[PDB]
Design a binder for this molecule. Structure first.
Ligand code: COH
Ligand code: COH
Ligand SMILES: *[C@@H]1O[C@H](CO)[C@@H](O[C@@H]2O[C@H](CO)[C@@H](O[C@H]3O[C@H](CO)[C@@H](O)[C@H](O)[C@@H]3O)[C@H](O)[C@H]2NC(C)=O)[C@H](O)[C@H]1NC(C)=O
Ligand SMILES: *[C@@H]1O[C@H](CO)[C@@H](O[C@@H]2O[C@H](CO)[C@@H](O[C@H]3O[C@H](CO)[C@@H](O)[C@H](O)[C@@H]3O)[C@H](O)[C@H]2NC(C)=O)[C@H](O)[C@H]1NC(C)=O
Ligand SMILES: CCCCCCCCO[C@@H]1O[C@H](CO)[C@@H](O)[C@H](O)[C@H]1O
Ligand SMILES: CCCCCCCCO[C@@H]1O[C@H](CO)[C@@H](O)[C@H](O)[C@H]1O
Ligand SMILES: CCCCCCCCO[C@@H]1O[C@H](CO)[C@@H](O)[C@H](O)[C@H]1O
Ligand SMILES: CCCCCCCCO[C@@H]1O[C@H](CO)[C@@H](O)[C@H](O)[C@H]1O
Ligand SMILES: Cc1cccc(Nc2ccccc2C(=O)O)c1C
Ligand SMILES: Cc1cccc(Nc2ccccc2C(=O)O)c1C
Ligand SMILES: *[C@@H]1O[C@H](CO)[C@@H](O)[C@H](O)[C@H]1NC(C)=O
Ligand SMILES: *[C@@H]1O[C@H](CO)[C@@H](O)[C@H](O)[C@H]1NC(C)=O
Ligand SMILES: [N+]
Ligand SMILES: [N+]
Ligand SMILES: [N+]
Ligand SMILES: [N+]
Ligand SMILES: [N+]
Lengths: 551, 551
């Protein structure tokens, strides 16, 4: 297959012609030529006027005094935020195109929601090398890559100060649309909503939802333990959960997402959002005494979806980005722009979000320490300390740095290996191919990638060619930005997927973004004043201070 | 329920406040006031400068010599057609909102693809009238309305000259997205693609597709009978079909849509499109000897989808509109506009497309006369005369007029009644409410509706109030436009739905609309040079002349 070398540049579409030749389709790439390598008139200009991502990043993370002014000039702040949304979203095809089984457009790839979609097509079946033509005939041993490059020896803390509230929010939030269906394969998902539908709270299906709802006052089932609201159990709901045999039945809490019993950090957020849902039911009831259970439930769900997107942009991404510019959740920024209110979760989004280096060597709640053997699947801990203590402890405990290499806890070593194996099963293209896909200059040496000698040396021995390094390993060994949690590629590839999943949501469409959609102005206000602090304050006893970074 | 009266005007959203008050959300309506009845300044100008639908109709249906010069000026034709698309499309909510079970926005209604969506919310469960407040407590008897207003007396021809090639094309084409799931009820659909995916050719599920495919050269299974290609049998495919016990096994044709064995008219088009798919496979094979069966099949499907959209716009709608303006299928017209590339089939679009008055009293094939007793479920008639004979005959036989009342054949009488009963099951609002929903002045009198004295009297007898008249009856009895098949309301409610289903297709999106998507320039040209005449000419022996109008 002549397309195995990935000849077409700048989003050009490669197509085989006969057995020995290829054709690049350069339609609307802004380029032309055999390989779509020659820039057009208008393309030379924007390229000249476009600073590098690292330059833009420096600007957004400095000049605090300047941004304090910009952040308070609404016309300016909106124009900037609007530009961030549109420019990043242009990098995603919507409606979606490829998946693991189709490196060409097809109705099957478009219509079948059980697949993760793909930002880059899979490496065709019969190629010289696994990645195309670069590198050796076989890829290096995945177990070796993890130990040599990803396995943690010494815990490296996040210089941005990310805490465990951040780490567990990340896992909780993203696991509503990263729901890999392993009984089918890594190419497939159980998240057919393909975005922020809060299925990890209400369940993926109506049958599961019904098991979790109280069907009174629009509320969800719950328990009162030690004076505080907690999720129901498997027994009471008959809603299935993944628990190992060890865990006694009375500690088998049932929430929307089947795997959230895995770790108390997830159950913490599961509990908090559950409280939030029922809290919002009470507010809506006061607002609408004439409403029934169904409209109370449905309306509350739309509120919490709004709250989620609000919090994710203005607190979560805000901290993550390190920007001094104040991001804004405001659907109206797009009502005069071209934008598709739909989303399809990309497999590569899933891969890059394996942020397991975030995880500490031990989990510290109050004055006690827990290793992974004690902490995992142990809801006794949650009940022992309560949510307030959890929030206070997690707010204080620093998370690990994601980029920079060698920071994956040994406890989750096999997860990193599987992430590599599965990406090979799905025939991912190389790291440099994904750099180019998101308008980044490909790395020219291993030393350039890591900005260092030790790992870059190990990498050269394992892959041989820089164009043979795989996506996932490279993301975790890449040179971090100055005092940043991530390197360039993580940010530049992840941001488009994220914002598309957030603003692509139906509630952001002009037909939905009305107070009536949310039961009036009171309901609408809950969304537009939501923050991670107010979420904790309204639902956690004592209203402890919280944040996504350490005090 | 204060919203029972439908207080809010101009797309404003009604919401209950307490047990006896209502609030109207006027956001982005261009209106304000308690009921969104007060136009803004700009709204008033627009309102003053906009010509009535009956005006734009008259212009487009006259000045023949003028349109010829327009039609031959690209810039002008493109600009006109571009406006045609955007203007109508703004009338549809996309992504969708309501369904039969939800008169308020909810995640269940948005996300659950098994529902037809709703352009107008259902009447609340407990209003004074089933239509709200207007009308008698009980709706008029379904049977009487059919007999008094809809049932045929003498066959009324279509002034626009629509033939049976048009009548059966309409049934075939629309039945890929009108797939009512009567197992669940009239509110539900089996067409989860919600548009033009050609599932009626290839099957709704992958399992049914595999039963119909040959898995050689991308082709679909078929029989050669009398030297001509026909669809395969149920026995050779195991693809279940709806057939009465009488039908012999060898005449049990299997095609994508389970119900297409119901009339030879459907099976004719099913045959023709089947030939077209296999014809396109041959073309692509010549273009791509290196391609496998899978890529050959998928690319052919995308080509046939485009073919379908091309034909429907530039031939089918082109005829139905009666416009002298040459309609154009050109996705490129929207690449600079705001437009959502997605669609959800509206229940009202289903209800309005019940064009059973199109049907003749007998079907004329060649030199013979078949009534409904001998025509229905009779695939032998198809093999007797063959496709070429069916085409030549159906091109000649005139279809019945849809608007004007009293032109529904007695055979499909119970269907016309069912269409009314189910509309009540799904709690449709009144005809006049749907008038307003699509920017049409509501009718003030029964005589204004029909433009006639006899039927109007029967309507007033049955309903009493003009605002108590139902959607489906009124659509049929409405005054037809001058020598036209339909009245004002049919066109103005139907066109938005149709164009949304056509241009909202993923292949019209910028990422898909390029030659590489369809195997190159050759495949691309098949779409862009397709027509109803070319369809028949390439797949029907003798290349008979055909059209959607009698010569
Ligand atoms: C911020 C991101 C984040 C965090 C904090 C996190 C925290 C933790 C954690 C304790 C806190 C544990 C014990 C694990 C352990 C696992 N994680 Co994560 N994970 C995270 C991101 C992910 C993602 C993304 C996946 C893939 C999801 C899928 O496909 O369903 C994942 C998958 C897994 C798997 C599945 C392995 C496989 O073979 O597919 C295990 C096991 N893990 N992780
Ligand atoms: C141009 C439009 C058109 C045509 C030519 C047509 C031609 C014919 C035809 C012979 C040529 C016959 C015997 C029928 C008879 C029927 N049609 Co139509 N139908 C048409 C538009 C529709 C539509 C739209 C539906 C609803 C589809 C659904 O929901 O599944 C329908 C449904 C039906 C049903 C379903 C039963 C019910 O409960 O309504 C019957 C029976 N029929 N139709
Ligand atoms: C889309 O909406 C459909 C209509 O509500 C929904 O179908 C409904 O699903 C529920 C739950 O699966 C069915 O109720 C079930 O109730 C008992 C359990 O208490 C079961 O034993 C029954 O067999 C029954 O399945 C409703 O009967 C069913 N309604 C129908 C088919 O009309 C779909 O599930 C919704 N789709 C999704 C993806 O959630
Ligand atoms: C979306 O893509 C999925 C992957 O291709 C697809 O699942 C596949 O479905 C087929 C047919 O249902 C399964 O094949 C079946 O073959 C025999 C018949 O000979 C059955 O008896 C078997 O039980 C088997 O189900 C594939 O095994 C299956 N592949 C998987 C699960 O990986 C989905 O059907 C597609 N979705 C839609 C809506 O079409
Ligand atoms: C269109 C807005 C452009 C104004 C911002 C100009 C920022 C200049 O910044 C420059 O960018 C170069 C690469 O981007 C770097 O090599 C230089 O070190 C840096 O000074
Ligand atoms: C309008 C004022 C422009 C200021 C731009 C400053 C450019 C700083 O330079 C940046 O420093 C980074 C390291 O800190 C490097 O990684 C970047 O490549 C480099 O562009
Ligand atoms: C708890 C997750 C949702 C957070 C939404 C913000 C709720 C914070 O609290 C709210 O502050 C408002 C001030 O405008 C008050 O009107 C509300 O009564 C109060 O509950
Ligand atoms: C069969 C329904 C789709 C019709 C596609 C066009 C059919 C006309 O026929 C096509 O005309 C072209 C000349 O322009 C030739 O290149 C093709 O070989 C020929 O098949
Ligand atoms: C604008 C911006 C800047 C930096 C990071 C992000 N977002 C991400 C980047 C990488 C990975 C994930 C995200 C995310 O928000 O989930 C955004 C949206
Ligand atoms: C532009 C135009 C004008 C008049 C009728 C239509 N289309 C329809 C109108 C009513 C019912 C159906 C349709 C249709 O295309 O199916 C169009 C698209
Ligand atoms: C779970 O946590 C409790 C404290 O809440 C502890 O006593 C117990 O030993 C833990 N379980 C395991 C297996 O370590
Ligand atoms: C079906 O059509 C054939 C002629 O093609 C005719 O002989 C036969 O009687 C028809 N069947 C019925 C039930 O009328
Ligand atoms: N740089
Ligand atoms: N369940
Ligand atoms: N551990
Ligand atoms: N089937
Ligand atoms: N008949």
């Amino acid at each position: 297959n002549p397309c195995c070398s990935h000849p077409c540049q700048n989003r050009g579409v490669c197509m085989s012609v006969g057995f020995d030749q290829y054709k690049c389709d350069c339609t609307r790439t802004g380029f032309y030529g055999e390989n779509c390598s020659t820039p057009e008139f208008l393309t030379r200009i924007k390229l000249f006027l476009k600073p590098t991502p690292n330059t833009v990043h420096y600007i957004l993370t400095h000049f605090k005094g300047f941004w304090n002014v910009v952040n308070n000039i609404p016309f300016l702040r909106n124009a900037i935020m609007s530009y961030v949304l549109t420019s990043r979203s242009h990098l995603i095809d919507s409606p979606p195109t490829y998946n693991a089984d189709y490196g060409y457009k097809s109705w099957e790839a478009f219509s079948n929601l059980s697949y993760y979609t793909r930002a880059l097509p899979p490496v065709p079946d019969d190629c010289p090398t696994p990645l195309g033509v670069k590198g050796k005939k076989q890829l290096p041993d995945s177990n070796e890559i993890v130990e040599k490059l990803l396995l943690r020896r010494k815990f490296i803390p996040d210089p941005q100060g990310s805490n465990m509230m951040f780490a567990f929010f990340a896992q909780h939030f993203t696991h509503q649309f990263f729901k890999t269906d392993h009984k089918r394969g890594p190419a497939f998902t159980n998240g057919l909503g393909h975005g922020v539908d809060l299925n990890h709270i209400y369940g993926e299906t109506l049958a599961r939802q019904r098991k979790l709802r109280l069907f009174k006052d629009g509320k969800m089932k719950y328990q009162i333990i030690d004076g505080e609201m907690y999720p129901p159990t498997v027994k009471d709901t008959q809603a299935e959960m993944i628990y190992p045999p060890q865990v006694p039945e009375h500690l088998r809490f049932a929430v929307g997402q089947e795997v959230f019993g895995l770790v108390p950090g997830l159950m913490m957020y599961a509990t908090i959002w559950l409280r939030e849902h029922n809290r919002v039911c009470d507010v809506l009831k006061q607002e609408h005494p004439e409403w029934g259970d169904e409209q109370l439930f449905q309306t509350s769900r739309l509120i919490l979806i709004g709250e989620t997107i609000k919090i994710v942009i203005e607190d979560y991404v805000q901290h993550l980005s390190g920007y001094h510019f104040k991001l804004k959740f405001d659907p109206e920024l797009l009502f005069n722009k071209q934008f598709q209110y739909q989303n399809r979760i990309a497999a590569e989004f899933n891969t890059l979000y394996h942020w397991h280096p975030l995880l500490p060597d031990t989990f510290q709640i109050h004055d006690q320490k827990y290793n992974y053997q004690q902490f995992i699947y142990n809801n006794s801990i949650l009940l022992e300390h309560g949510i307030t203590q959890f929030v206070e402890s997690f707010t204080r405990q620093i998370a690990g740095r994601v980029a920079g290499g060698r920071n994956v806890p040994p406890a989750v070593q096999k997860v990193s290996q599987a992430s590599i194996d599965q990406s090979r099963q799905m025939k991912y293209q190389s790291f440099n191919e994904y750099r180019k896909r998101f308008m980044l200059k490909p790395y020219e040496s291993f030393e350039e990638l890591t900005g260092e000698k030790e790992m870059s040396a190990e990498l050269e021995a394992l892959y041989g060619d820089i164009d043979a390094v795989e996506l996932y390993p490279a993301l975790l060994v890449e040179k971090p930005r100055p005092d940043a949690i991530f390197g360039e590629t993580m940010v530049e590839v992840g941001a488009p997927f994220s914002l598309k999943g957030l603003m692509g949501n139906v509630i952001c469409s002009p037909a939905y973004w009305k107070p009536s959609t949310f039961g009036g102005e009171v309901g609408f206000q809950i969304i537009n004043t939501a923050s991670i602090q107010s979420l904790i304050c309204n639902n956690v006893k004592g209203c402890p201070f919280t944040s996504f970074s350490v005090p």
